[PDB]
Design an enzyme around this catalytic site. Structure first.
Site, PDB file in Angstrom:
ATOM      1  N   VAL A 117       0.856  -1.191   0.000  1.00  0.00           N
ATOM      2  CA  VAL A 117       0.000   0.000   0.000  1.00  0.00           C
ATOM      3  C   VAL A 117       0.891   1.239   0.000  1.00  0.00           C
ATOM      4  CG1 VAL A 117      -1.815   1.298   1.177  1.00  0.00           C
ATOM      5  CG2 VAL A 117      -1.859  -1.224   1.208  1.00  0.00           C
ATOM      6  N   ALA A 126       5.227   5.660  -5.413  1.00  0.00           N
ATOM      7  CA  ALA A 126       4.286   4.864  -6.197  1.00  0.00           C
ATOM      8  C   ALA A 126       5.001   4.080  -7.288  1.00  0.00           C
ATOM      9  CB  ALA A 126       3.195   5.759  -6.796  1.00  0.00           C
ATOM     10  N   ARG A 329      -7.297   2.721  -4.055  1.00  0.00           N
ATOM     11  CA  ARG A 329      -8.209   2.855  -2.916  1.00  0.00           C
ATOM     12  C   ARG A 329      -8.844   4.242  -2.966  1.00  0.00           C
ATOM     13  NH1 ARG A 329      -6.938   1.649   3.451  1.00  0.00           N
ATOM     14  NH2 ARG A 329      -5.300   3.218   3.111  1.00  0.00           N
ATOM     15  N   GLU A 423     -13.550  -3.055   8.076  1.00  0.00           N
ATOM     16  CA  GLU A 423     -12.855  -2.212   9.042  1.00  0.00           C
ATOM     17  C   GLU A 423     -13.811  -1.347   9.859  1.00  0.00           C
ATOM     18  OE1 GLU A 423     -11.526   1.098   5.593  1.00  0.00           O
ATOM     19  OE2 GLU A 423     -10.037   0.301   7.002  1.00  0.00           O
ATOM     20  N   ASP A 451      -8.476   0.821  11.547  1.00  0.00           N
ATOM     21  CA  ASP A 451      -9.794   1.451  11.517  1.00  0.00           C
ATOM     22  C   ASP A 451     -10.783   0.672  12.374  1.00  0.00           C
ATOM     23  OD1 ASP A 451      -9.544   2.890   8.272  1.00  0.00           O
ATOM     24  OD2 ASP A 451     -10.187   3.932  10.111  1.00  0.00           O
ATOM     25  N   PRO A 532       4.337  -2.358   4.291  1.00  0.00           N
ATOM     26  CA  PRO A 532       4.553  -0.917   4.130  1.00  0.00           C
ATOM     27  C   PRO A 532       5.596  -0.497   3.104  1.00  0.00           C
ATOM     28  CG  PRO A 532       5.831  -1.705   5.982  1.00  0.00           C
ATOM     29  CD  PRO A 532       5.055  -2.896   5.465  1.00  0.00           C
ATOM     30  N   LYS A 610       6.669   8.129   9.127  1.00  0.00           N
ATOM     31  CA  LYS A 610       7.297   7.353  10.188  1.00  0.00           C
ATOM     32  C   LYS A 610       7.461   8.243  11.410  1.00  0.00           C
ATOM     33  CE  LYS A 610       9.909   4.490   6.943  1.00  0.00           C
ATOM     34  NZ  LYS A 610      11.183   3.766   6.651  1.00  0.00           N
ATOM     35  N   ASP A 622      -0.807   6.607   9.778  1.00  0.00           N
ATOM     36  CA  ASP A 622      -1.753   7.172   8.825  1.00  0.00           C
ATOM     37  C   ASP A 622      -3.040   7.467   9.590  1.00  0.00           C
ATOM     38  OD1 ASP A 622      -3.255   4.728   8.894  1.00  0.00           O
ATOM     39  OD2 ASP A 622      -3.195   4.531   6.698  1.00  0.00           O
TER      40      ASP A 622
HETATM   41  O1  LIG Z   1      -6.177  -1.086   9.221  1.00  0.00           O
HETATM   42  C1  LIG Z   1      -6.728  -0.178   8.518  1.00  0.00           C
HETATM   43  O2  LIG Z   1      -7.712   0.519   8.769  1.00  0.00           O
HETATM   44  C2  LIG Z   1      -6.117   0.186   7.164  1.00  0.00           C
HETATM   45  O3  LIG Z   1      -6.818   0.506   6.206  1.00  0.00           O
HETATM   46  C3  LIG Z   1      -4.603   0.237   7.025  1.00  0.00           C
HETATM   47  C4  LIG Z   1      -3.959   1.325   6.569  1.00  0.00           C
HETATM   48  O4  LIG Z   1      -4.651   2.339   5.916  1.00  0.00           O
HETATM   49  C5  LIG Z   1      -2.514   1.682   6.826  1.00  0.00           C
HETATM   50  C6  LIG Z   1      -1.988   1.752   8.123  1.00  0.00           C
HETATM   51  C7  LIG Z   1      -0.647   2.111   8.334  1.00  0.00           C
HETATM   52  C8  LIG Z   1       0.189   2.423   7.260  1.00  0.00           C
HETATM   53  C9  LIG Z   1      -0.306   2.373   5.958  1.00  0.00           C
HETATM   54  C10 LIG Z   1      -1.657   2.007   5.747  1.00  0.00           C
HETATM   55  F1  LIG Z   1      -2.100   1.968   4.518  1.00  0.00           F
HETATM   56 MG   LIG Z   2      -8.521   1.619   7.101  1.00  0.00          MG
END
Ligand SMILES: O=C(O)/C(O)=C/C(=O)c1ccccc1F
Ligand SMILES: [Mg+2]
Ligand SMILES: [Mg+2]
Ligand SMILES: [Mg+2]
Length: 716
Positions: A117, A126, A329, A423, A451, A532, A610, A622
């Site tokens: 992600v 990206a 997303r 989530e 989330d 990550p 970070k 995030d």
């Molecule tokens: O567990 C969630 O709600 C979820 O969607 C995960 C993340 O958005 C995320 C959390 C930390 C670093 C990058 C990320 F993309």
């Molecule tokens: Mg999320």
């Protein structure tokens, strides 16, 4: 105004120009038809979007009142379930079914492996993520703590051969365990040849082939002395690079230079919780990167890799994708964005816009890049992750939104597939119904556990004080939620059709720990899980070579391992759970993580950073991690665990520490000493003190307001 009138809409000129000049050319869509479609889709779906948001508020108000009306010991689970059922929160379970989603690429239906992600607004990240489909195992082992930096094995400014030899031996063990020889060990190999379509590994005494010759997938160079050998295990490729003239190859018994792993099989290009985008200028920066990715020509201060060429074991040239298969997303149903306003000045729903614009842009990844073959889905699908949905009506709305966008775009119905984030609690407890509502579009379900934890706290905010943030990870509700998700996916026929996914590893530098513990996710039957970084993608790939996820999923079929009572077990703290020092550590840790994240969000528009925690562990923050920290502190303040002076003192104590961590950069404005002059400091304070009042505990309303405030003050 600098806006364009289309029907009832007033479109920011930068977005109008980007769509007409960059996104539409090449799609055969008439610009006039497209913008009339935007007007009609926004007009038609906005009322239902609003009605869904109002239903969230109605349900939460009833739940708040239910807890405030009660005094009894713990929660009578029987009465609580009956209550949730009467108010429409817990819906009936539908009859069993199998999903019908078709036209999906093998990377999703079949291949088990890591999912990366990345923030779509950072073109350099990206590109690295799309290129992360292949990654050097030697680099990932040498450059992280997977090989410990013990005496003599430390990283220095130049190559440490004792460490390199440790890397080599780790990788030889991996090969022995993944693609075993008929006899002997890869540790003793002295060379590789391709003979009669089969791989022959020279040993010091004998020669040997593979125990399973079918794991030989190809080679480069002459069969007589190949430059590389391609293997396959559990559907994932491994490439041994052979070069005795290289720095590493000259030290190696077989001339091996590196081992390359197929790593990030898929990548999610993120418009949501990892980016900060509060106006049309920000959204266009993201849309343009998404466009460059789909057209194949994104290039940064670095380009996308082309596919990789091999020779088949029995002759014949073939190709393997050089890039990860890309999802996007979108944002969820909550927020509006003034990139488009209507004639009354009302902002348009951002999720509806994302569907129109990222869906439009994705058409380019279905067709030939001029910078060669088409970039993304050869089977004709567009893959959209839809986050933060609450229950099956909200999933059905997303399906109808996609159906309407397909019509505007001239695409076949069900082109636009949905990765469903599990989530939010009302999705968890209605998950089977959520999957059914998207049964011909769904390509994964994923436990977005961060989330989900924020929603757990907010939903039961009035029930009492919650356990500490780190305790949440092991609470009964979340272990049930993880198994329940897998159970629902497998029962809906996801094996061989759709991904069953699990959540993000946030400790970006603790790679030894990740390799030790994240194997739990494929062992639990997840065909993918979130990483990550490209490095963590390569290291998590190791887990799918050890675990036969297809076999695990078949072994889980029909089992039902979570009850509704378990899912509904609210993580309330017990009597006298904490000493004063433990309460202080929790406040300080949460305040530092909130401040370290929010200061870069508000002042610099960075949606993921970070941030070292109170133990100096680097965590990728995030919006979801922020949702947890602010909601937990709001809950502790709500129930008298801490005072408002405790909160203020912690924020003021941690702020100059965050100022120090950022002293290194040009655009940083320190928060201390003049806290109340910092929009970022005030944003962090507001997220806590107003946290209980935010809808479902979401952080975007405050963050978007404060970022726009900062931009406005920097503009005058
Ligand atoms: O567990 C969630 O709600 C979820 O969607 C995960 C993340 O958005 C995320 C959390 C930390 C670093 C990058 C990320 F993309
Ligand atoms: Mg999320
Ligand atoms: Mg196996
Ligand atoms: Mg409320």
């Amino acid at each position: 105004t600098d806006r364009v009138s289309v029907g009832n809409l007033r479109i920011a000129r930068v977005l109008y120009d980007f769509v007409n000049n960059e996104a539409l050319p090449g799609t055969d869509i008439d610009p006039d038809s497209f913008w009339a479609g935007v007007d009609k889709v926004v007009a038609d779906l906005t009322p239902q979007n609003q009605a869904l948001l109002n239903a969230r508020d109605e349900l939460q108000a009833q739940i708040d009142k239910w807890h405030r009306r009660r005094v009894i010991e713990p929660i009578d689970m029987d009465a609580y379930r009956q209550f949730l059922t009467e108010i429409g929160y817990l819906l009936p379970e539908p009859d069993d079914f199998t999903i019908t989603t078709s036209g999906v690429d093998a990377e999703i239906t079949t291949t088990a492996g890591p999912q990366l992600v990345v923030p779509v607004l950072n073109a350099r990240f990206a590109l690295n993520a799309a290129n992360a489909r292949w990654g050097s195992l030697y680099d990932a082992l040498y450059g992280t703590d997977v090989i410990p930096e013990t005496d003599g094995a430390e990283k220095g400014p130049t190559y440490n051969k004792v460490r390199g030899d440790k890397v080599i031996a780790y990788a030889r063990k991996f090969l022995d365990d993944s693609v075993p020889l008929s006899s002997g060990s890869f540790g003793d190999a002295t060379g590789f040849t391709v003979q009669d379509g089969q791989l022959v590994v020279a040993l010091p005494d004998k020669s040997t082939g593979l125990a399973n010759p079918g794991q030989f997938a190809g080679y480069t160079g002459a069969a007589e002395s190949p430059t590389s050998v391609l293997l396959i295990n559990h559907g994932l490729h491994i490439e041994i690079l052979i070069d005795p003239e290289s720095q590493v190859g000259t030290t190696d018994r077989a001339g091996v230079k590196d081992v390359i792993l197929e790593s990030a099989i898929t990548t999610i290009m993120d418009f949501e919780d990892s980016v900060a985008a509060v106006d049309a200028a920000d959204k266009v920066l993201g849309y343009r990167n998404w466009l460059g990715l789909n057209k194949g020509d994104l290039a940064a201060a670095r380009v996308l890799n082309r596919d990789r060429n091999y020779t088949a074991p029995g002759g014949g040239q073939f190709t393997l994708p050089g890039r990860s298969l890309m999802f996007v997303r979108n944002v969820g149903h909550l927020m509006t964005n003034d990139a488009i306003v209507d004639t009354d000045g009302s902002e348009v729903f951002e999720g509806i816009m994302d569907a129109l614009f990222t869906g439009l842009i994705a058409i380019h990844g279905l067709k030939a890049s001029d910078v060669g073959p088409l970039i993304n889905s050869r089977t004709g699908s567009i893959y959209i992750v839809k986050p933060k949905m609450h229950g099956p009506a909200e999933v059905a709305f997303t399906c109808e939104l996609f159906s309407r966008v397909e019509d505007v775009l001239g695409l076949p119905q069900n082109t636009m597939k949905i990765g469903i984030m599990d989530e939010e609690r009302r999705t968890t407890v209605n998950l089977k119904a959520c999957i059914k509502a998207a049964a011909d579009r769904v390509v994964f379900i994923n436990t977005g556990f961060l989330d989900r934890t924020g929603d757990e706290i907010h939903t039961s905010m009035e029930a009492g004080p919650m356990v500490r943030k780190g305790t949440m990870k092991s609470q009964p509700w979340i272990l049930a939620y993880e198994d329940h998700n897998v159970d629902a996916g497998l029962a809906a026929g996801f094996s061989g059709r759709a991904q069953v996914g699990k959540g993000m590893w946030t400790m970006t530098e603790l790679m030894a720990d990740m390799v030790e513990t994240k194997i739990a996710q494929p062992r639990a039957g997840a065909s993918t899980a979130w990483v990550p970084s490209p490095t963590a993608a390569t290291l998590h790939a190791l887990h799918y070579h050890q675990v036969d996820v297809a076999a695990v999923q078949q072994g889980l079929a029909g089992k039902r391992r979570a009850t509704i009572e378990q899912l509904l077990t609210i993580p309330l703290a017990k009597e006298l759970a904490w000493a004063p020092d433990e309460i202080r550590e929790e406040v300080d840790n949460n305040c530092q993580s909130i401040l370290g994240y929010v200061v870069r969000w508000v002042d610099q528009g960075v949606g993921a950073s970070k941030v070292p925690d109170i133990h100096d562990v680097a965590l990728m923050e995030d919006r979801a991690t922020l949702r947890i920290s602010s909601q937990l502190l709001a809950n502790w303040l709500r129930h008298g665990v801490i005072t408002s002076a405790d909160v203020r003192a912690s924020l003021e104590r941690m702020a100059p520490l965050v100022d120090r961590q950022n002293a290194g950069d040009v655009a940083y404005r320190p928060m201390a000493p003049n806290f109340d002059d910092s929009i970022a400091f005030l944003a962090a304070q507001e997220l806590i003190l107003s946290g209980a009042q935010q809808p479902n505990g979401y952080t975007e309303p405050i963050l978007h307001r404060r970022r726009r405030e900062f931009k406005a003050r920097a503009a005058e």
